[PDB]
Design a protein around this ligand. Structure first.
Ligand SMILES: Cc1cc2nc3c(=O)[nH]c(=O)nc-3n(C[C@H](O)[C@H](O)[C@H](O)COP(=O)(O)O)c2cc1C
Ligand SMILES: Cc1cc2nc3c(=O)[nH]c(=O)nc-3n(C[C@H](O)[C@H](O)[C@H](O)COP(=O)(O)O)c2cc1C
Ligand SMILES: [Cl-]
Ligand SMILES: [Cl-]
Lengths: 219, 219
């Protein structure tokens, strides 16, 4: 096993991977850890789709690219500068996931949080109800589950990168998954993906805020 | 220290606390761990306000109650039973934090995710851009931080409950904090609270989904 703080401070966004496998049994451990995460009213708004199928990983890449190109055709009319930065960004911060042996699609569902049905019952303005979602407790919950998964990967000798940069193409990703596998998402939609494998060594991360910057102790 | 899985499977929502203090040094270790969480584009959209001052904790409770009562007097006109369910809910799942020695207010700020500025650039429909936020990557990031805090609390001999049920009164909570401490939130807003202490014995958690239900291995 591995001690908690060790895993926490070891954690990086892994974007380069060794040519080694990740066992289904180890992935299942990661998922059990995710499943034990806290969630708003125990909604447990998560479902992990584990993909090792190369052609499916590549088909998902292709749909991201198709959607990205549709956006780029319009961006080029406004600012080739901005369009070109987007071209580089998707390459380096989305499609790098093909470098890993495992792609995990994390599906989720909307959690209507405390206050929502109470305010709806009394015909509160939508503007008031919307304020509950600026701090989206449903996505806090998803993040707790994905962080449990992430730390457990590290304990088991692996590492990962969390991804939401694909989500302008989420509908298209869901569609190809369904065509290729018959997976039925129901009310769920894509929340995040994880690129998962054995990390290369000597990976880099940006500096973080000093702990004293991110807190205030009231005296 | 404590091994990761041991911490993950020890974690419960702690709503009853022993009469014992939490050291500032230990709380700082929790926040340092929180600050190591991944976040979209390294935004680190979190600030932890640590409160031990009893009168401020009570003042926060009173604005939660006052806001609750404004909702209740309208709910009673539609459904007294539903209003009664909300009365019980707020006692059991919100105002119990007063039972702990420490209240942490977790402030956060909006993260405009990938796709946002690109779609804005090309005057994409607001309804399209809104879809990025149904999986709010900023709040996924916040959840990752608060989970790191949560697990660290357990390793150090404490426990906590995560709260978002107060957030129909978030603005009012922020106003009390500001009025009583001088804290300047700037662009940040209340995301969650944590009730933090040495946990009571015999804590109960609800039944969870079986792991087979929360994953799919594509074959
Ligand atoms: C973002 C989020 C918000 C939550 N808000 C509350 C809350 O306001 N009050 C409460 O009593 N529990 C709250 N919880 C705890 C959940 O009720 C709890 O995690 C769930 O019932 C599972 O129970 P367990 O944590 O003991 O395993 C919250 C959890 C999450 C992650
Ligand atoms: C919800 C969220 C979404 C993220 N999306 C992406 C992404 O699409 N592409 C990527 O390369 N990294 C992504 N990341 C990783 C962050 O860029 C990374 O956590 C941050 O830069 C800090 O680097 P570190 O994780 O190595 O410490 C995401 C992280 C979070 C938590
Ligand atoms: Cl993003
Ligand atoms: Cl809530």
């Amino acid at each position: 096993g591995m001690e908690l703080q060790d895993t926490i401070f070891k954690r990086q966004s892994v974007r380069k991977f060794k040519n080694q496998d990740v066992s289904d049994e180890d992935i299942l451990k990661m998922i059990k850890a995710a499943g034990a995460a806290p969630s708003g009213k125990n909604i447990q708004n998560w479902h992990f789709v584990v993909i090792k199928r190369r052609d499916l990983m590549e088909k998902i890449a292709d749909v991201i690219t198709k959607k990205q190109q549709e956006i780029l055709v319009e961006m080029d009319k406004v600012s080739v500068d901005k369009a070109n930065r987007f071209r580089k960004f998707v390459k380096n911060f989305t499609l790098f996931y093909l470098k890993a042996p495992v792609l995990v699609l994390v599906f989720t569902k909307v959690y209507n949080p405390s206050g929502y049905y109470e305010l709806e019952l009394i015909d509160a303005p939508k503007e008031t109800i919307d304020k509950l979602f600026i701090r989206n407790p449903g996505m806090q919950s998803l993040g707790a589950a994905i962080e449990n998964f992430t730390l457990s990967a590290i304990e088991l000798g692996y590492g990962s990168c969390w991804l939401t940069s694909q989500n302008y193409a989420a509908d298209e990703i869901e569609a190809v998954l369904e065509a290729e596998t018959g997976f039925e998402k129901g009310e769920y939609f894509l929340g995040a993906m994880l690129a998962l494998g054995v990390p290369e060594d000597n990976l880099k991360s940006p500096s973080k805020k000093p702990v004293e910057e991110i807190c205030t102790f009231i005296k």
